[PDB]
Ligand binder design. Sequence first.
Ligand code: HEM
Ligand code: HEM
Ligand code: HEM
Ligand code: HEM
Lengths: 146, 146, 141, 141
Amino acid sequence: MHLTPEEKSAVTALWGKVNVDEVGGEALGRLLVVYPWTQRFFESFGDLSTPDAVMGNPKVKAHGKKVLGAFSDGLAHLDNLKGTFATLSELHCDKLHVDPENFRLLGAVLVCVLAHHFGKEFTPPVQAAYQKVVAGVANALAHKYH
Amino acid sequence: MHLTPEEKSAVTALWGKVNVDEVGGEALGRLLVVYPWTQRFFESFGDLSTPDAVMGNPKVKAHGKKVLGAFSDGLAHLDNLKGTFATLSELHCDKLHVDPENFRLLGAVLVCVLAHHFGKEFTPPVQAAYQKVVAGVANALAHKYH
Amino acid sequence: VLSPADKTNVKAAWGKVGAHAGEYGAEALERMFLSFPTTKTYFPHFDLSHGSAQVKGHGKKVADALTNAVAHVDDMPNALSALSDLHAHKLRVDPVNFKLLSHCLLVTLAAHLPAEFTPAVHASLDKFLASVSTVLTSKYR
Amino acid sequence: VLSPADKTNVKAAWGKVGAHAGEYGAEALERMFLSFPTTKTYFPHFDLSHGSAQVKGHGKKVADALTNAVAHVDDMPNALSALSDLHAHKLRVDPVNFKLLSHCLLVTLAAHLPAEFTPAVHASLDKFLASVSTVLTSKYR
Ligand code: HEM
Ligand code: HEM
Ligand code: HEM
Ligand code: HEM
């Protein structure tokens, strides 16, 4: 990454306070609600007819936890996101057919969830470092598309 | 910059046929005409009120030639665009204050210009090589922004 | 919004396309697949090989729709309603991809109509495709 | 298109902002400048340092305009004619930038209106800022 030691420490430190279970479920669900078209990949999850139905859908919450899980582990290889997400990049391309733009939508949603959760703690400088990470992650995941 | 050798030969072969003076004037003029907001940087160029006023403006033509001149040099250092464009990146940021999105608009216009000029010779695969190139140059020009 | 001038420009350039619309539609697709590989994620079910009949078939459909929007330039929202519904509810193509196809359509026309692809016409065609894209995406949320 | 639910959601949310809109305007700009430094290209004449009065002042201006937009949620195009003009013919900010400020505004609201920033409200505000953005760039060409 093009993260400053100071930027790295800010990311790292806020992350330590995150409940991936809850943030994962919330980020994915918000995604399905704010940008309804992302629902095209989760038809098998059920009823996503309403915010309520999305936010309550356990399949959603559990997929959300899987995604933030993988994200969370990528924060440990911040100096090689490319290599950490290589296999996941191929899968997303070759098996899932997920347009990389979705990676960017989620990232933005992720940042809104963190702000939502941390209020005061999520300062302009801290958001700036997270913006760099979400962009970094999205790029890494889209890297193997062909 | 993922230019395969064959993509690089293709860029270079076509570039051999270009009249930079001419293409430069056309690309810059067309930019000012398709995305008129870009005219914000050239209020000292005079009359840009209509397409003919823009396309024929001696100042637009001279500036276009300058711009494409710097671009051609870039094409001889496809290996090190960032280095090649560093002082220009700084200038555009610090002195000129040019939003980098401008570099991407110009790249799209340039691709249309090359298509216009080369007709059938600007094949799907040649366009794809040039798409990688204009993106690499835009990125190089934006690398020093802060 | 398209001005009288724009409308004239578009009917004129599209007029010249005539009977080649179908082929130009297929070509724009191929250019898109080659330059913006991420767009391929929407056609997992297609043979995207060079000269694919699926691509040929699809290029024609897209070209027919554009031809229909030109024919109804003063009532596009209504002329394209059906297609707007399909994209919003079934296909669910991310909006950013419309700009990519638009771009490849402009390249294609440029490559085929040298005499008509003037600065003025280029500008009108760009506003036109942007408006088509806007209609097709209007019912997304 | 803003649904009635949307209009309600927006008015509620903005209702809670109250006397802090100016501070939230200022905070959104600050967040924009830091996260998307390319946006600073439009403010060479400002002191973009933390707590600058130029930024505070501008923050108020923006906040105020949003207020006026919420109030005329039914007639935005008309309520914002002048602003659409200013941006299209004077400022000429590239359209991609509106999405950046919109995002920093959501983040700001989220961080300040926890209880109120529900998923449905988040969706509504986003559409709202999108509509505002559309209005502001509608006369660009
Ligand atoms: C932060 C970015 C993301 C990360 C780290 C990520 C990671 C993952 C992981 C670890 C899996 C598990 C699959 C396996 O190992 O077999 C998965 C599956 C999947 N992801 Fe992604 N993902 C991301 C973004 C997205 C987005 C934005 C979408 C669509 C909106 C998406 C759609 C899917 C789908 C459809 C599956 C398959 C789940 C199933 O089998 O039902 N992913 N992802
Ligand atoms: C391929 C991308 C570009 C290249 C290689 C390029 C190159 C150059 C060069 C070589 C100069 C002269 C430097 C000097 O005065 O010392 C220049 C100046 C300038 N460029 Fe760029 N340029 C590019 C894109 C753009 C775009 C897209 C815009 C605006 C939309 C722009 C705005 C300007 C302006 C306003 C000046 C100064 C003109 C003056 O002398 O008053 N450039 N550029
Ligand atoms: C202005 C641009 C566009 C136009 C005029 C257009 C028009 C159409 C038309 C006429 C069809 C066929 C509907 C039918 O079955 O009768 C279609 C289908 C489709 N379009 Fe769009 N479209 C546009 C943009 C896009 C973009 C940008 C994408 C994705 C990159 C896309 C993806 C699809 C897909 C996946 C289908 C279904 C194809 C099939 O399964 O046969 N469209 N479109
Ligand atoms: C949410 C959308 C926006 C709204 C409601 C908005 C509103 C305003 C308002 C109310 C003014 C002041 C008019 C006056 O001075 O009388 C203004 C000016 C200005 N806006 Fe916009 N704006 C928006 C988006 C943007 C964006 C994204 C940018 C650039 C990144 C921008 C750049 C400017 C600039 C440079 C000025 C003039 C500043 C000065 O010299 O005081 N605006 N805008």
